[PDB]
Amino acid sequence: SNAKNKESPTKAIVRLREHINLLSKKQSHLRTQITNQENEARIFLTKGNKVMAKNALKKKKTIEQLLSKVEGTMESMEQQLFSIESANLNLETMRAMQEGAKAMKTIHSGLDIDKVDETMDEIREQVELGDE
Template sequence: MLSYFFGGGSASKNKDAPKKAILDLREHITLLGKKEAHLQTQVTSQEQQARALLGKNNKTGAKNALKRKKTYESQLVKIQAQMDSLEQQLYSIESANLNLETMKAMKQGASAMKNIHKGMDIDKVDETMDEIREQVELGEEISDAISRPLHAGAEVDEDEIDEELAALAQESVKQEVVAPPQGLPSVPLGKVSTPHAATLPAGQEQNAEEEEDEEEDEDERALRELQAEMGL
Protein backbone atom coordinates (compact mmCIF):
# COMPACT_ATOMS: atom_id res chain seq x y z
CA MET A 1 0.00 0.00 0.00
CA LEU A 2 2.81 2.44 0.88
CA SER A 3 4.48 1.74 -2.43
CA TYR A 4 1.28 2.76 -4.17
CA PHE A 5 1.29 6.22 -2.49
CA PHE A 6 5.05 6.87 -2.63
CA GLY A 7 5.72 5.31 -6.00
CA GLY A 8 7.96 2.56 -4.65
CA GLY A 9 6.59 0.02 -7.11
CA SER A 10 7.22 2.11 -10.23
CA ALA A 11 10.90 1.20 -10.36
CA SER A 12 10.09 -2.49 -10.15
CA LYS A 13 7.49 -2.15 -12.91
CA ASN A 14 9.93 -0.32 -15.15
CA LYS A 15 12.49 -3.02 -14.54
CA ASP A 16 10.10 -5.82 -15.52
CA ALA A 17 8.49 -3.92 -18.40
CA PRO A 18 10.83 -5.23 -21.13
CA LYS A 19 10.37 -8.83 -20.01
CA LYS A 20 6.57 -8.44 -19.90
CA ALA A 21 6.53 -6.87 -23.35
CA ILE A 22 8.58 -9.73 -24.75
CA LEU A 23 6.27 -12.32 -23.23
CA ASP A 24 3.14 -10.52 -24.51
CA LEU A 25 4.56 -10.24 -28.01
CA ARG A 26 5.48 -13.92 -28.13
CA GLU A 27 2.03 -14.89 -26.90
CA HIS A 28 0.30 -12.73 -29.51
CA ILE A 29 2.54 -14.05 -32.30
CA THR A 30 1.58 -17.59 -31.27
CA LEU A 31 -2.11 -16.63 -31.43
CA LEU A 32 -1.70 -15.11 -34.88
CA GLY A 33 0.11 -18.25 -35.98
CA LYS A 34 -2.88 -20.35 -35.04
CA LYS A 35 -5.19 -17.92 -36.90
CA GLU A 36 -2.90 -18.15 -39.95
CA ALA A 37 -3.11 -21.95 -39.95
CA HIS A 38 -6.93 -21.82 -39.73
CA LEU A 39 -7.20 -19.38 -42.64
CA GLN A 40 -4.82 -21.48 -44.72
CA THR A 41 -7.07 -24.49 -44.11
CA GLN A 42 -10.15 -22.48 -45.19
CA VAL A 43 -8.42 -21.34 -48.38
CA THR A 44 -7.59 -24.93 -49.29
CA SER A 45 -11.12 -26.11 -48.43
CA GLN A 46 -12.85 -23.44 -50.54
CA GLU A 47 -10.65 -24.25 -53.51
CA GLN A 48 -11.55 -27.93 -53.24
CA GLN A 49 -15.26 -27.07 -53.05
CA ALA A 50 -15.01 -24.88 -56.14
CA ARG A 51 -13.39 -27.74 -58.07
CA ALA A 52 -16.08 -30.18 -56.92
CA LEU A 53 -18.97 -27.86 -57.79
CA LEU A 54 -17.45 -27.05 -61.14
CA GLY A 55 -17.30 -30.75 -61.85
CA LYS A 56 -21.05 -30.91 -61.27
CA ASN A 57 -21.61 -27.96 -63.62
CA ASN A 58 -22.63 -25.82 -60.63
CA LYS A 59 -20.85 -22.68 -61.73
CA THR A 60 -22.70 -20.43 -59.28
CA GLY A 61 -21.66 -22.54 -56.29
CA ALA A 62 -18.12 -22.77 -57.60
CA LYS A 63 -18.00 -19.02 -58.06
CA ASN A 64 -19.18 -18.39 -54.49
CA ALA A 65 -16.57 -20.81 -53.16
CA LEU A 66 -13.84 -18.90 -54.99
CA LYS A 67 -15.12 -15.63 -53.51
CA ARG A 68 -14.87 -17.07 -49.99
CA LYS A 69 -11.39 -18.27 -50.86
CA LYS A 70 -10.36 -14.74 -51.85
CA THR A 71 -11.77 -13.39 -48.57
CA TYR A 72 -9.77 -15.89 -46.53
CA GLU A 73 -6.65 -15.14 -48.58
CA SER A 74 -7.06 -11.42 -47.90
CA GLN A 75 -7.34 -12.06 -44.16
CA LEU A 76 -4.38 -14.41 -44.35
CA VAL A 77 -2.21 -11.70 -45.93
CA LYS A 78 -3.16 -9.27 -43.14
CA ILE A 79 -2.41 -11.84 -40.43
CA GLN A 80 0.99 -12.58 -41.95
CA ALA A 81 1.80 -8.86 -42.14
CA GLN A 82 0.86 -8.45 -38.46
CA MET A 83 3.04 -11.39 -37.52
CA ASP A 84 5.96 -9.88 -39.42
CA SER A 85 5.53 -6.56 -37.59
CA LEU A 86 5.28 -8.24 -34.19
CA GLU A 87 8.32 -10.43 -34.82
CA GLN A 88 10.36 -7.40 -35.89
CA GLN A 89 9.26 -5.53 -32.79
CA LEU A 90 10.05 -8.54 -30.62
CA TYR A 91 13.53 -8.74 -32.09
CA SER A 92 14.10 -5.02 -31.45
CA ILE A 93 12.92 -5.27 -27.84
CA GLU A 94 15.04 -8.34 -27.16
CA SER A 95 18.09 -6.64 -28.67
CA ALA A 96 17.46 -3.47 -26.64
CA ASN A 97 16.94 -5.51 -23.49
CA LEU A 98 20.17 -7.40 -24.14
CA ASN A 99 22.01 -4.11 -24.57
CA LEU A 100 20.48 -2.90 -21.32
CA GLU A 101 21.57 -5.98 -19.42
CA THR A 102 25.03 -5.70 -20.95
CA MET A 103 25.31 -2.09 -19.82
CA LYS A 104 24.18 -3.07 -16.33
CA ALA A 105 26.83 -5.76 -16.16
CA MET A 106 29.50 -3.34 -17.40
CA LYS A 107 28.35 -0.73 -14.90
CA GLN A 108 28.57 -3.24 -12.07
CA GLY A 109 32.04 -4.23 -13.23
CA ALA A 110 33.14 -0.60 -13.32
CA SER A 111 31.73 -0.06 -9.85
CA ALA A 112 33.56 -3.11 -8.54
CA MET A 113 36.85 -1.91 -10.04
CA LYS A 114 36.25 1.52 -8.55
CA ASN A 115 35.72 0.01 -5.11
CA ILE A 116 38.86 -2.09 -5.51
CA HIS A 117 40.97 0.91 -6.49
CA LYS A 118 39.32 3.24 -4.01
CA GLY A 119 42.09 2.92 -1.45
CA MET A 120 44.89 2.69 -4.02
CA ASP A 121 46.89 5.19 -6.02
CA ILE A 122 50.20 5.06 -7.82
CA ASP A 123 52.06 6.85 -5.02
CA LYS A 124 50.87 4.36 -2.43
CA VAL A 125 51.75 1.47 -4.71
CA ASP A 126 55.29 2.83 -5.21
CA GLU A 127 55.64 3.37 -1.48
CA THR A 128 54.53 -0.18 -0.76
CA MET A 129 56.97 -1.60 -3.32
CA ASP A 130 59.82 0.40 -1.77
CA GLU A 131 58.94 -0.99 1.65
CA ILE A 132 58.95 -4.51 0.25
CA ARG A 133 62.38 -3.99 -1.32
CA GLU A 134 63.73 -2.61 1.97
CA GLN A 135 62.44 -5.63 3.86
CA VAL A 136 63.97 -8.00 1.32
CA GLU A 137 67.36 -6.29 1.64
CA LEU A 138 67.05 -6.37 5.43
CA GLY A 139 66.30 -10.08 5.30
CA GLU A 140 69.42 -10.70 3.19
CA GLU A 141 71.56 -8.71 5.63
CA ILE A 142 70.16 -10.69 8.55
CA SER A 143 70.85 -13.96 6.72
CA ASP A 144 74.45 -12.90 6.03
CA ALA A 145 74.93 -11.92 9.67
CA ILE A 146 73.61 -15.27 10.90
CA SER A 147 75.86 -17.19 8.47
CA ARG A 148 79.00 -15.26 9.47
CA PRO A 149 81.50 -17.27 11.68
CA LEU A 150 81.34 -16.47 15.37
CA HIS A 151 85.14 -16.60 15.98
CA ALA A 152 87.46 -14.16 14.25
CA GLY A 153 90.19 -16.84 14.13
CA ALA A 154 88.02 -18.96 11.89
CA GLU A 155 88.32 -16.48 9.08
CA VAL A 156 90.71 -17.56 6.29
CA ASP A 157 92.89 -15.27 4.22
CA GLU A 158 92.40 -16.38 0.63
CA ASP A 159 95.60 -14.66 -0.57
CA GLU A 160 97.68 -16.48 2.02
CA ILE A 161 96.13 -19.79 0.99
CA ASP A 162 96.96 -19.11 -2.67
CA GLU A 163 100.61 -18.30 -1.85
CA GLU A 164 101.02 -21.46 0.22
CA LEU A 165 99.46 -23.54 -2.55
CA ALA A 166 101.87 -22.06 -5.14
CA ALA A 167 104.87 -22.81 -2.87
CA LEU A 168 103.79 -26.43 -2.46
CA ALA A 169 103.39 -26.80 -6.21
CA GLN A 170 106.89 -25.39 -6.87
CA GLU A 171 108.46 -27.65 -4.24
CA SER A 172 106.74 -30.67 -5.78
CA VAL A 173 108.14 -29.80 -9.22
CA LYS A 174 111.70 -29.51 -7.80
CA GLN A 175 111.45 -32.90 -6.14
CA GLU A 176 110.34 -34.52 -9.37
CA VAL A 177 113.34 -33.04 -11.24
CA VAL A 178 115.99 -34.01 -8.62
CA ALA A 179 114.75 -37.47 -7.68
CA PRO A 180 115.77 -40.28 -10.12
CA PRO A 181 113.04 -42.35 -11.62
CA GLN A 182 112.18 -45.29 -9.45
CA GLY A 183 112.78 -48.80 -10.78
CA LEU A 184 115.76 -47.86 -13.05
CA PRO A 185 119.44 -48.80 -12.35
CA SER A 186 121.73 -46.01 -11.26
CA VAL A 187 124.34 -44.79 -13.73
CA PRO A 188 127.99 -45.39 -12.56
CA LEU A 189 130.08 -42.29 -12.10
CA GLY A 190 133.41 -43.88 -13.08
CA LYS A 191 134.91 -44.31 -16.57
CA VAL A 192 132.93 -46.61 -18.74
CA SER A 193 134.89 -48.95 -20.91
CA THR A 194 133.93 -49.14 -24.54
CA PRO A 195 133.65 -52.42 -26.45
CA HIS A 196 136.87 -51.64 -28.39
CA ALA A 197 138.74 -51.18 -25.10
CA ALA A 198 137.82 -54.62 -23.83
CA THR A 199 140.78 -56.74 -22.68
CA LEU A 200 141.69 -59.58 -25.11
CA PRO A 201 144.04 -62.54 -24.68
CA ALA A 202 147.64 -62.05 -25.83
CA GLY A 203 147.39 -64.26 -28.90
CA GLN A 204 144.19 -62.70 -30.10
CA GLU A 205 145.56 -59.21 -29.53
CA GLN A 206 148.62 -59.95 -31.71
CA ASN A 207 146.47 -61.41 -34.48
CA ALA A 208 144.31 -58.33 -34.43
CA GLU A 209 147.34 -56.09 -34.81
CA GLU A 210 148.62 -58.16 -37.73
CA GLU A 211 145.23 -57.97 -39.44
CA GLU A 212 145.23 -54.20 -39.04
CA ASP A 213 148.75 -53.99 -40.59
CA GLU A 214 147.69 -56.17 -43.50
CA GLU A 215 144.65 -53.95 -44.11
CA GLU A 216 146.93 -50.87 -44.12
CA ASP A 217 149.36 -52.55 -46.60
CA GLU A 218 146.51 -53.46 -48.93
CA ASP A 219 145.22 -49.91 -48.79
CA GLU A 220 148.63 -48.47 -49.60
CA ARG A 221 149.13 -50.95 -52.43
CA ALA A 222 145.74 -50.09 -53.96
CA LEU A 223 146.57 -46.40 -53.66
CA ARG A 224 149.91 -46.82 -55.49
CA GLU A 225 148.25 -48.79 -58.28
CA LEU A 226 145.70 -46.08 -58.75
CA GLN A 227 148.41 -43.40 -58.92
CA ALA A 228 150.32 -45.43 -61.54
CA GLU A 229 147.26 -45.73 -63.71
CA MET A 230 146.76 -42.01 -63.54
CA GLY A 231 150.43 -41.32 -64.39
CA LEU A 232 151.18 -39.66 -61.10
Protein backbone atom coordinates in the same frame (compact mmCIF):
# COMPACT_ATOMS: atom_id res chain seq x y z
CA SER B 1 12.49 -1.99 -8.22
CA ASN B 2 15.09 -1.84 -11.04
CA ALA B 3 14.52 -5.61 -11.29
CA LYS B 4 10.95 -4.76 -10.37
CA ASN B 5 10.91 -2.82 -13.76
CA LYS B 6 13.19 -5.27 -15.65
CA GLU B 7 10.58 -8.02 -14.93
CA SER B 8 7.87 -5.51 -15.85
CA PRO B 9 9.23 -4.79 -19.43
CA THR B 10 9.93 -8.63 -19.62
CA LYS B 11 6.20 -9.45 -18.96
CA ALA B 12 5.51 -6.65 -21.49
CA ILE B 13 7.42 -8.83 -24.07
CA VAL B 14 5.28 -11.67 -22.70
CA ARG B 15 2.02 -9.99 -23.66
CA LEU B 16 3.28 -9.39 -27.19
CA ARG B 17 4.19 -13.07 -27.39
CA GLU B 18 0.74 -14.21 -26.23
CA HIS B 19 -0.70 -11.90 -28.87
CA ILE B 20 1.55 -13.55 -31.48
CA ASN B 21 0.29 -16.94 -30.35
CA LEU B 22 -3.31 -15.80 -30.74
CA LEU B 23 -2.57 -14.42 -34.17
CA SER B 24 -0.92 -17.70 -35.22
CA LYS B 25 -3.93 -19.69 -34.05
CA LYS B 26 -6.15 -17.38 -36.08
CA GLN B 27 -3.83 -17.81 -39.06
CA SER B 28 -4.06 -21.57 -38.83
CA HIS B 29 -7.83 -21.36 -38.68
CA LEU B 30 -7.98 -19.12 -41.74
CA ARG B 31 -5.63 -21.42 -43.65
CA THR B 32 -7.85 -24.39 -42.83
CA GLN B 33 -10.84 -22.42 -44.10
CA ILE B 34 -8.89 -21.59 -47.26
CA THR B 35 -8.08 -25.22 -47.85
CA ASN B 36 -11.75 -26.10 -47.38
CA GLN B 37 -12.87 -23.45 -49.86
CA GLU B 38 -10.31 -24.60 -52.40
CA ASN B 39 -11.46 -28.19 -52.06
CA GLU B 40 -15.06 -27.13 -52.54
CA ALA B 41 -14.11 -25.16 -55.67
CA ARG B 42 -12.34 -28.29 -56.95
CA ILE B 43 -15.48 -30.32 -56.31
CA PHE B 44 -17.49 -27.77 -58.29
CA LEU B 45 -14.93 -28.09 -61.10
CA THR B 46 -15.22 -31.92 -61.23
CA LYS B 47 -19.01 -31.40 -61.51
CA GLY B 48 -18.49 -28.89 -64.31
CA ASN B 49 -20.13 -25.95 -62.57
CA LYS B 50 -17.44 -23.34 -63.21
CA VAL B 51 -19.82 -20.56 -62.15
CA MET B 52 -20.08 -21.89 -58.62
CA ALA B 53 -16.38 -22.84 -58.65
CA LYS B 54 -15.50 -19.19 -59.38
CA ASN B 55 -17.88 -18.10 -56.62
CA ALA B 56 -16.09 -20.41 -54.18
CA LEU B 57 -12.80 -18.90 -55.42
CA LYS B 58 -14.27 -15.44 -54.68
CA LYS B 59 -14.71 -16.56 -51.07
CA LYS B 60 -11.28 -18.24 -51.14
CA LYS B 61 -9.67 -14.93 -52.20
CA THR B 62 -11.76 -13.05 -49.62
CA ILE B 63 -10.24 -15.15 -46.85
CA GLU B 64 -6.78 -14.80 -48.43
CA GLN B 65 -7.18 -11.04 -48.11
CA LEU B 66 -8.01 -11.51 -44.40
CA LEU B 67 -5.01 -13.87 -44.06
CA SER B 68 -2.75 -11.17 -45.52
CA LYS B 69 -4.11 -8.76 -42.89
CA VAL B 70 -3.34 -11.20 -40.06
CA GLU B 71 0.10 -12.02 -41.46
CA GLY B 72 0.90 -8.31 -41.77
CA THR B 73 -0.29 -7.65 -38.20
CA MET B 74 1.72 -10.64 -36.97
CA GLU B 75 4.84 -9.39 -38.75
CA SER B 76 4.32 -5.96 -37.12
CA MET B 77 3.93 -7.52 -33.68
CA GLU B 78 7.11 -9.56 -34.25
CA GLN B 79 9.06 -6.40 -35.19
CA GLN B 80 7.69 -4.57 -32.15
CA LEU B 81 8.57 -7.44 -29.83
CA PHE B 82 12.04 -7.88 -31.41
CA SER B 83 12.75 -4.15 -31.17
CA ILE B 84 11.96 -4.17 -27.45
CA GLU B 85 13.63 -7.50 -26.64
CA SER B 86 16.81 -7.03 -28.68
CA ALA B 87 17.14 -3.52 -27.23
CA ASN B 88 17.09 -4.84 -23.67
CA LEU B 89 19.41 -7.74 -24.52
CA ASN B 90 21.95 -5.36 -26.07
CA LEU B 91 21.61 -2.86 -23.18
CA GLU B 92 22.42 -5.56 -20.61
CA THR B 93 25.21 -7.04 -22.78
CA MET B 94 26.77 -3.60 -23.29
CA ARG B 95 26.47 -2.87 -19.54
CA ALA B 96 28.48 -6.02 -18.81
CA MET B 97 31.05 -4.95 -21.39
CA GLN B 98 31.38 -1.49 -19.85
CA GLU B 99 31.57 -2.91 -16.32
CA GLY B 100 34.41 -5.15 -17.52
CA ALA B 101 36.13 -2.05 -18.86
CA LYS B 102 35.51 -0.34 -15.51
CA ALA B 103 37.18 -3.30 -13.79
CA MET B 104 40.21 -2.89 -16.07
CA LYS B 105 40.23 0.83 -15.33
CA THR B 106 40.22 -0.05 -11.62
CA ILE B 107 43.08 -2.51 -12.14
CA HIS B 108 45.07 -0.01 -14.21
CA SER B 109 44.49 3.01 -11.99
CA GLY B 110 44.60 0.78 -8.92
CA LEU B 111 48.12 -0.57 -9.41
CA ASP B 112 50.80 2.11 -8.75
CA ILE B 113 53.70 -0.03 -10.21
CA ASP B 114 53.26 0.39 -13.10
CA LYS B 115 50.56 1.34 -15.67
CA VAL B 116 48.86 -2.02 -16.18
CA ASP B 117 47.33 -1.11 -19.55
CA GLU B 118 50.56 0.37 -20.92
CA THR B 119 52.59 -2.67 -19.85
CA MET B 120 50.00 -4.92 -21.50
CA ASP B 121 50.80 -3.23 -24.82
CA GLU B 122 54.50 -3.46 -23.97
CA ILE B 123 54.46 -7.20 -23.30
CA ARG B 124 52.20 -7.67 -26.35
CA GLU B 125 55.02 -6.36 -28.53
CA GLN B 126 57.64 -8.42 -26.69
CA VAL B 127 55.61 -11.59 -27.32
CA GLU B 128 55.01 -10.69 -30.96
CA LEU B 129 58.75 -10.09 -31.46
CA GLY B 130 59.36 -13.74 -30.62
CA ASP B 131 58.38 -14.63 -34.21
CA GLU B 132 61.73 -13.23 -35.44
